[PDB]
Design a protein around this ligand. Structure first.
Ligand SMILES: COC(=O)c1ccc(SCc2ccccc2)c(S(N)(=O)=O)c1
Ligand SMILES: [Zn+2]
Length: 258
């Protein structure tokens, strides 16, 4: 009886195994755009993905991870609200059963069709496992997806999904360039929070871009053909793998823009 997003093991149950679920800096949150404070001290975000080396794509049972070689300083996030240098380890998405839901963060209560998370760890902690034990261990860049025109830079991901339909399947996935998933503007909101799946560790500086990217109805439909179940089990479509907004508590969301 492990955690998931099904009818009996979903987000409202997670606190029983992971009491940090009811903690002081949980994610995601609703971003109240009127209450977010412009912070002129924030720097432009620096996203340096020119030498990113993707390796593999994995159906992890909850979403799919596109994994990067993070054994050298290649693909890094810095600047913005961050001190030092964070290295890209993987990206994944969260999405809905319908276009009107699927994002984890919300903007003035608006839910997007999906949300991309590029996960990076702080190089001062040496590796990902040590970084997640620290309050400034991770930086996750969050990008909203809306349904409209296709994103040509997403198609290589969508095309490989039929090869990893079920939990625990992986496929080689080299030479994928995550710069093709970025919107034009790097204006962002930022706040201190958590992983959004167990173990829900409070180790993330969230950086959520204001401008969504557009993907086509066909691209998102292919996400919804994935399965939460293993091969040779009855089909459980991989949809609605998003955690809802959590209480903001004693936190301020800062904006990089006025
Ligand atoms: C459906 O979502 C996922 O499948 C998923 C998978 C990994 C991660 S971050 C890496 C990680 C490693 C080990 C344990 C937890 C998280 C996240 S998130 N939203 O917290 O960034 C979400
Ligand atoms: Zn995520």
């Amino acid at each position: 009886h492990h955690w998931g997003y099904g009818k009996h093991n979903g987000p409202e149950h997670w606190h029983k195994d992971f009491p940090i679920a009811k903690g002081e800096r949980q994610s995601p949150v609703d971003i109240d755009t009127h209450t977010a404070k412009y912070d002129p001290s924030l720097k432009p975000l620096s996203v340096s993905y020119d030498q990113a080396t993707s390796l593999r794509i994995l159906n992890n049972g909850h979403a799919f991870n596109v994994e990067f070689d993070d054994s050298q300083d290649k693909a890094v996030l810095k600047g913005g609200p961050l001190d030092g240098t964070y290295r890209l380890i993987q990206f994944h998405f969260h999405w809905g059963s319908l276009d009107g839901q699927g994002s984890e963060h919300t903007v003035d209560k608006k839910k997007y069709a999906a949300e991309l998370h590029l996960v990076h760890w702080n190089t001062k902690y040496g590796d990902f496992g040590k970084a997640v034990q620290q309050p400034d261990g991770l930086a996750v860049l969050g990008i909203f997806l809306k349904v409209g025109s296709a994103k040509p830079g997403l198609q290589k991901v969508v095309d490989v999904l039929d090869s990893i339909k079920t939990k625990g399947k992986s496929a080689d996935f080299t030479n994928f360039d995550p710069r093709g998933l970025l919107p034009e503007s790097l204006d962002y909101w930022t706040y201190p929070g958590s992983l959004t799946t167990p173990p829900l560790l409070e180790c993330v500086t969230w950086i959520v871009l204001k401008e969504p990217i557009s993907v086509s109805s066909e691209q998102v439909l292919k996400f919804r053909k994935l399965n939460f179940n293993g091969e040779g089990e009855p089909e459980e479509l991989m949809v609605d793998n998003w955690r809802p907004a959590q209480p903001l508590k004693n936190r301020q969301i800062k904006a990089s823009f006025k």
